[PDB]
């Protein structure tokens, strides 16, 4: 071990990690509640909804793509576009509390080297809660950015808008139950990317 002249406990982490995770989750929830109106101003899902209360789809973009498939051959691409999620009817707009709110339940179910390992478990729990919050922020950022990208591609005429057909029935029903004005709404064409590049429109900003 070193030179020739030199030749010649585990439960503390487990009980600290849960308490650190719960405490950091409570502090994160309080910090989220302090900034409720700013988050509502930033993640405004309500003003991105289309005409017939339809949530816009989510689009993903990649640039400068290379793939080494095997030896002797490679495949490269300039840009790529993908439809990650598809449009559908909604009744309510989404909110940030379904993405960012962390779960808090108070743990009420509980010395020479005990303190340092309890502190190590405390730090591990705080780091785990921070990682969970970072992943939630990345998820909500992706879901907002795809809806922004859909509007930009619709402005540059690369996606098709959804198509809505409505049928108006009159006074329907039998003698035991009537409905006065019935309308059935159905969307018939989902949004999709186009491959005919001759109809794409460019934008030059002065």
């Amino acid at each position: 071990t070193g030179s020739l002249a030199g030749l010649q406990k585990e439960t503390a982490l487990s009980v600290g990690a849960q308490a650190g995770l719960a405490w950091r989750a409570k502090i994160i929830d309080e910090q989220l509640n302090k900034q409720a109106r700013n988050l509502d101003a930033i993640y405004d899902f309500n003003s991105l909804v289309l005409e017939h209360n339809i949530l816009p789809p989510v689009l993903l973009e990649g640039r400068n793509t290379l793939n080494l498939a095997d030896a002797q051959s490679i495949r490269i691409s300039d840009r790529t576009y993908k439809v990650a999620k598809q449009a559908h009817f909604i009744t309510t707009p989404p909110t940030w509390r379904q993405y960012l709110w962390m779960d808090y339940v108070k743990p009420e179910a509980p010395k020479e080297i005990w303190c340092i390992y309890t502190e190590r478990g405390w730090k591990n729990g705080i780091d785990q809660a921070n990682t969970i919050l970072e992943e939630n922020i990345a998820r909500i950022k992706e879901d907002f950015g795809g809806m922004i990208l859909y509007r930009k591609l619709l402005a540059m005429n690369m996606v098709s808008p959804p198509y809505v057909s409505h049928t108006d029935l009159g006074v329907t029903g039998d003698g035991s139950e009537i409905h006065i004005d019935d309308r059935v709404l159905r969307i018939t064409a989902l949004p999709e990317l186009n491959v005919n590049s001759a109809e794409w429109r460019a934008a030059v900003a002065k």
Binding site: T65, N67, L68, A69, K141
Partner: protein
Amino acid sequence: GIPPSANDLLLHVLEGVPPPGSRRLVVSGGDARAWLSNEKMYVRTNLTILSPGWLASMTSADGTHAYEMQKSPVLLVSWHGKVMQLKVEGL
């Protein structure tokens, strides 16, 4: 036969969302994130990977790179013209 275009998980790696079913890896020494899904590493960073070699690559609009490569406990990166190493745990 036409070779495959890319892997579609790299768009989620570019956005920062981990692929489903994967587990996290611990990266020390620099600003990078790594995940392991199918005995392959997915790395999200804005550095330039130099030594170990990658299989697929994508780039975002703001300069973030996404890599698909084999598993390795060390990465060689260039930060601002200086070569350093990143250490990967949890493999």
